[PDB]
Design a protein around this ligand. Sequence first.
Ligand SMILES: CC/C=C\C[C@H]1C(=O)CC[C@@H]1CC(=O)N[C@H](C(=O)O)[C@@H](C)CC
Length: 552
Amino acid sequence: TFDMNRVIDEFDEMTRNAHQVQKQTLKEILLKNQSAIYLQNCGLNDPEEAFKSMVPLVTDVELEPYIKRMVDGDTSPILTGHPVPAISLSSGTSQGRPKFIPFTDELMENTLQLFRTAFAFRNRDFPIDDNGKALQFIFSSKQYISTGGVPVGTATTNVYRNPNFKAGMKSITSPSCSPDEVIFSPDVHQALYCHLLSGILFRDQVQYVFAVFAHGLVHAFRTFEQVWEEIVTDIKDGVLSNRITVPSVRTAMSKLLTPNPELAETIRTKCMSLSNWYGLIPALFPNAKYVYGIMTGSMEPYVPKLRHYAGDLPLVSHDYGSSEGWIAANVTPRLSPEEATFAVIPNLGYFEFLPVEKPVGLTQVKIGEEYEVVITNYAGLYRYRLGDVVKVIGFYNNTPQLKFICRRNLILSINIDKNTERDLQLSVESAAKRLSEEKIEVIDFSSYIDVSTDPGHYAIFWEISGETNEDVLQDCCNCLDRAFIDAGYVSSRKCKTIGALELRVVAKGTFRKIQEHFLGLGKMPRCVKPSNAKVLQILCENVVSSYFSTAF
Ligand SMILES: CC/C=C\C[C@H]1C(=O)CC[C@@H]1CC(=O)N[C@H](C(=O)O)[C@@H](C)CC
């Protein structure tokens, strides 16, 4: 039974005792998983001491073969003491291959604990009506079964399809406007339309608006700009647009629709009153208290447009975690996304921090210093290098408050996509075999994030060893686009939040000219940063042709 003050007091005591809770949490993780051959092979059977001397830092790549066994249905103890109920398909890759992370019942408990904690602080500073609803733009369009018989989904999908999700969120959320059939629609574009319509149908009750990521909220209302008159028509007629073809979705939404020309008129008058859609969100939902979602890190570029739609509504930052697990909660919800920091929850894992040198404990980190995060938790992860670099902004009682700084080895990112030099090189090598058919080779390559388009897209620069046809180059272009298998990139391309990959072919001698540039001053950049004007200049002025992927 949820009690706001009780929840806050519990978080307070835990963070006052963060050092002790860290140690107790490690001991419990090690007890639960002691039969895991990964742990047995380290010499485990001074528990904290033994742990740090016997267990090596490890990377996703090192864990790949172990996790592969779990995805293939091995139920003996490998990374966990008990068989996992699901596997999470993560963003990013494992050396260019799909990256999987175990999803355990404990991770579900953690999710519920963190949501409850964050809600308590948020509802303290931004109290909502408990007879209202929320507009929640969430999606779980798919969860497949591995060949070994294990469910595989994204982390959010594993959360949304958990048997404890509805009951567990009941007390610490405002009820969604959307039918479950919308959330689980196999077609996310239809789901999004229906979320928008559902929100409008209950607009007076909507207490806040949520999506996991800021770019999702922005995409939602950009979409509204396109379909608003269609929604007004659906409401006026009490008939769902023929755009919606998923039968279970049509059925569910039809129960909510009856002819309402009055509401339709209100909405039409309201939309036409806006100036370039400024303040669209509070206009549609005049009782919403805030907009909620991840506003930080890779989402920072989306905040200006989100503010535009949000008008004067507070933007509240959603918490810090990934497919690997949760780390930190926003307990200062009134702070803008620029000032937002996240307090580590001391029982969600045994956290270590590599100085940006060997790792220090949670209560050992220093204000103003940057560290790479190291995770030991209930996801089968022991001293796992997350690759996230954080800065310690301060302490909330004895737990550090963190700001995300950067992700190591990342060169290509628009929103939720994460691609490295190796991923780019692999995509190039894939697409190059279409060229090899023509006895043509890739002389060199680079790339660039083009955010002049909406949405932004990847641009790849190629110089090739000979002239070829448009069809060949079109194929190479499509292949480059499909060769990026990172789940984040694929998810965005499908949801249209990342545009068609563009292949720009440059004139012969273009890359040598870049060499000449650097030689006349005295390692080819694989993604050209916006500030690298001299290099960008040489590439752009030598583009001779341009192609856009017809994939997705
Ligand atoms: C136990 C952890 C449970 C949930 C973590 C996720 C959240 O609910 C908030 C942050 C996080 C987003 C995430 O997992 N994003 C995916 C990813 O980037 O891997 C993406 C492939 C979309 C699902």
